[PDB]
Amino acid sequence: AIPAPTDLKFTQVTPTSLSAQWTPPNVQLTGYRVRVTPKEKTGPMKEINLAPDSSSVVVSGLMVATKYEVSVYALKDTLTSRPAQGVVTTLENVSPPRRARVTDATETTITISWRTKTETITGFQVDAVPANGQTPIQRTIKPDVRSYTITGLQPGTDYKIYLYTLNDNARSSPVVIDASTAIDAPSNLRFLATTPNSLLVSWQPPRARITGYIIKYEKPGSPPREVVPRPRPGVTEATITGLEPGTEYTIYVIALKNNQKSEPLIGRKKT
């Protein structure tokens, strides 16, 4: 007479599957018999034989929104343990988003778009997880929507975006897409010092984890030139030299993150 498997639990229920797990009986086993049967005679009952070293099972191909009785028998040749039993109700049907795409990216927002099978939907869930140890941004989305903008994000930041279809309690697997907010510009250009041949420019730092700056300058009728060398992060002042006296120059300050550039901070100053 064999001991029943012990400590049965279910680790996941989906619309068409269930995952169970148990502590094997402390005995030499032949195998297992797993019975999954619909409580009301609404459809197919399932029965799965397992290796004797089994400790867990995933039973798929089930009917959605259906109550099932679950029985795990431990087997030793001609002997059968009493069953470890559980009850499971599968979720309502639900399918992941199709063709999910990032369509727009700003310093503070990201816009995504997707399609779906024509099924009953009650909503969507999105989780935007930043790459920098920071806290995820979770939002809930109305069911008729196919385009959404996640607002209040950090500039110059990488996000993994997890989008799920909701149908009441049923949540689909996430679709996973990648995007990055724009590098935010330096702000507040000030010309601290002026000479007939030079300017000392000043700016305030952006909020992104930048790797450097570019400074460009430009007179009417000339292509822009960069200040050498590029200012390193932490720097908030730079000198532009070798200019003409009495000339209007336009200054562009670009924040860098590796090879990504912000839109330029711009300003003008004479001589």
The total number of structural domains that make up the chain: 3
The answer to whether 63 and 47 have CB atoms below 8 angstroms apart is no
The answer to whether 171 and 164 have CB atoms below 8 angstroms apart is yes
Asked if residue 188 and residue 271 are part of one domain, the reply reads yes
Which residues are CB-contacts of 228 (< 8 A; sequence separation ≥ 6)?
none
Asked if residue 88 and residue 25 are part of one domain, the reply reads yes
Asked if residue 271 and residue 227 are part of one domain, the reply reads yes
Peptide bond before residue 229 is cis, with ω within 30 degrees of 0: yes
Give the residue from 182, 215, 246 where a domain finishes.
182
Residue 219 is encoded by which pair of tokens? 């007179």
Asked if residue 187 and residue 167 are part of one domain, the reply reads no
Count of residues making up the chain: 271
Residue 190 is encoded by which pair of tokens? 């000030």
Asked if residue 103 and residue 79 are part of one domain, the reply reads no
Which residues are CB-contacts of 239 (< 8 A; sequence separation ≥ 6)?
198, 199, 200, 201, 227
Asked if residue 83 and residue 32 are part of one domain, the reply reads yes
Asked if residue 220 and residue 164 are part of one domain, the reply reads no
* 147: CATH: 2.60.40.10
The answer to whether 15 and 59 have CB atoms below 8 angstroms apart is no
Asked if residue 160 and residue 123 are part of one domain, the reply reads yes
Residue 247 is encoded by which pair of tokens? 């000339």
**How would DSSP label each residue in 146-167?**
SEEEE-SPPTT-EEEEEEEEEE
CA dist., res. 162 & res. 182, Å (int): 20
Asked if residue 173 and residue 192 are part of one domain, the reply reads no
Burial 201-230 (b: 16+ CB within 10 A, else e): bebebbebebbbbbbbbeeeeeeeeebeee
Residue 129 is encoded by which pair of tokens? 């997880």
The answer to whether 45 and 55 have CB atoms below 8 angstroms apart is no
Give the residue from 61, 92, 123 where a domain finishes.
92
Q: What resolution in angstroms, rounded to 1 decimal?
A: 2.4
| DSSP state for residue 172 in the 8-state scheme | P
CA dist., res. 184 & res. 169, Å (int): 39
Range of the domain at 52: 1-92
Asked if residue 164 and residue 145 are part of one domain, the reply reads yes
Give the residue from 137, 167, 182 where a domain finishes.
182
Asked if residue 75 and residue 103 are part of one domain, the reply reads no
| DSSP state for residue 77 in the 8-state scheme | T
| DSSP state for residue 204 in the 8-state scheme | E
Residue 36 is encoded by which pair of tokens? 């999954």
Asked if residue 83 and residue 15 are part of one domain, the reply reads yes
Instruction: Identify how the structure was determined.
Output: X-ray
CA dist., res. 259 & res. 140, Å (int): 34
- Only one residue has tokens 């908030």, namely 236
Identity of residue 157 = T
